[model samples]
Target: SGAIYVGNYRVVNRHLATHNDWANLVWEDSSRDLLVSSTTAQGCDTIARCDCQTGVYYCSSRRKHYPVSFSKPSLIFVEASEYYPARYQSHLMLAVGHSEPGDCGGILRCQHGVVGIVSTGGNGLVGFADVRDLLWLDEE
Candidate 1:
C-alpha cells in the first residue's frame, strides 16, 4: 500500500494514478475500494503527482499548484520491491461527457454511473473512483 498525499490530507491507501480529462488522481482504503478521493481538475484540466516534501498538488495543464493536508500517524509506505508498473502503454481515460473518446481498450472510463480505470498491457481493473466526488482543482 502507498500514500495519497494531498491538501493536508494523506490517505494511506492502496492506489494512485494519472488519468482522465484532467489528471485523475485517486485514493482509497483497501477496506472500502468504492469510497475514494479523486483530485480532478477545473479550468486547467490536468493534475499530476504531488511532491512529498512540498505537499503541493501540481496541475500541469494549468501550470499551478495547491496546498494539501498532511497525515503523520496514518501513512502507508509502498516499498520499491512491492511496487509494479503498468505493463501496457498508459493513457488517460475520461468520463463519457468529458469530450474525450470512450470505449477504448485501455484507459479509464465513467459512464452510466460506473467509473473504472484500466491498466496497461492486460488492461485490468486497476482502480475506480466515485463519480460524484471527483473534486476539481481550481485556478486560484
Candidate 2:
C-alpha cells in the first residue's frame, strides 16, 4: 500500500465524507473504504471521492475535461455501461470524446477540489470515478 500526505496547519484526515466546512485533522477509517487528509491549502480541495450521480460531478456538472497538464477539453457525458463498458469501470464516466489513445492516469477536480480520477480509456469516452469507487474495486 501507498500514501499521500499534505499540511500547513493541523492535517485533517477524515473519511472523505463527514466534516465541518473547515475540513478535518489527521485520521483514518475503513467505513467509506478510504480516508483523506484534507487541507485549506491551494490547488485541490483534498476531497478524493466527489459525487458523479444524476446531479453534480458527472452529468449536469459543468467541469472541464483535462487530458494532461495545460490541456483541457470541454466536458460531456453518456449514461452507463449499457451502450459501452470496460473491464475496469466505474458507474459515472466522462465523455472525453476519445481525448487520448491512453494516459488518463490522474484525478478529477473542480472549484470544490479533488473528487475523481480516470477509470481508464480506449473507447469513445473516458470513464471516471470517485476516490471511493477506486477502492470499491479492491473489495470486489
Candidate 3:
C-alpha cells in the first residue's frame, strides 16, 4: 500500500507472516511452537514467538522503540497452549491489518485481526463448502 495506518491485530482460534506488498491476511498452521514469520525489512520480518498464554504477542525488529504496527513487516506466533483446542473439531481464526493512514504523513499502517474460537462441526461454523466458497481467515 502507498500510505496507510491500520493497527496491527491478531486473531487466535487454533493457529498462525509477510512482506511490503503483502499485508492483511491470516491463516492457521500445525507446526512447531505454533508461530512463524515472513519478511526482510530493516526490522521484524522474521520468526517470532506467540504469547497468547499471556494475552500478549510481543515482537521486535532490528529497530528499537518502534511499535509493532500492522504492515506484515514481520511474522507472528500463536501459543501452542491457545491453539490446542479441547477437541479436534475446533480451529482458530486470525487476521492482520490492511492499508490505512498512519500517525505520520503518508505513512502506511495496518490493523491485525482478533483471535476467535470456531467449531467446524456445529452451528458456529455456518457455511457451504461444496460450492467451492471457502471461508478462509486469510489469503495466501
Candidate 4:
C-alpha cells in the first residue's frame, strides 16, 4: 500500500502577534481532553470543552463558544503558529456554532453571581454550526 502524503502545513505565525486579545479564541490539550481557552473579562483564563460537533464549551462557569466562523482557520492558525501533537489535530474536527442547553436542564451556578436554569428547551443557544469551529489554546 502506498503511504499517502498529507498536505503541507502552512505557517500562520504572522497572525500570532495580533491574535492575543481576550476576544480571541484558542485551544489547549488539557492532559488528554481537548479544551478551548479564551480570556475572560477579568483577564483570567477560562477553559472548557468542545462538545463534539457543536463547537461550544461546557465551560465550567458557563456555556461559552467562539464565533463559529473562527474555528477551523483559528485552529489551523494555532497549528501553524503553536505546537500540538498531530494526533490531537484529528480531534479538532468538530462543528462550531451556538450552544444549546441540550439536556442540562437543572439550575447551574455557571459563574460567580450568575446562575442558569433551563426549564424549557426553546431558550437554548443558537448560531452558525460548522465543523471548522475549533480554536487552540496558548497554554494549559
What TM-score would each prediction reach against the true structure? 0.20, 0.35, 0.16, 0.18
Provide the overall lDDT of each model, using Cα atoms, as 2-decimal numbers: 0.25, 0.35, 0.21, 0.24
Sorting all predicted structures by TM-score, with the top scorer first, yields 2, 1, 4, 3
Instruction: State which candidate, 1 or 2, has the greater lDDT.
Output: 2
lDDT at position 106, candidate 4: 21
Candidate 4 per-residue lDDT over residues 43-137, each given as its tens digit: 22232333322222332223442322222212221121122232222222222333333422222121321121111112233212112222222
Q: Judged by TM-score, which candidate is best? A: 2
Model 3 lDDT, residue 50, Cα: 31
Q: What's the residue-level lDDT of 138 in candidate 4?
A: 19
Residue 58 in candidate 2, Cα distance off native in Å? 15
Model 4 is weakest, by summed lDDT over 10 consecutive residues, at: 1-10
Candidate 3 per-residue lDDT over residues 4-107, each given as its tens digit: 11123232212322242225333334421121232232332112223231111211211112222221112223222322443322122222211111111111
Which candidate model has the greater lDDT, 2 or 4? 2
Which candidate comes out best when scored by lDDT? 2
lDDT of 1: 0.25
lDDT per residue for candidate 2 within 18-111, as digits (tens), equals 4551355343432222344444653313544444332222221223444322112222343333323323332334544333312232354554
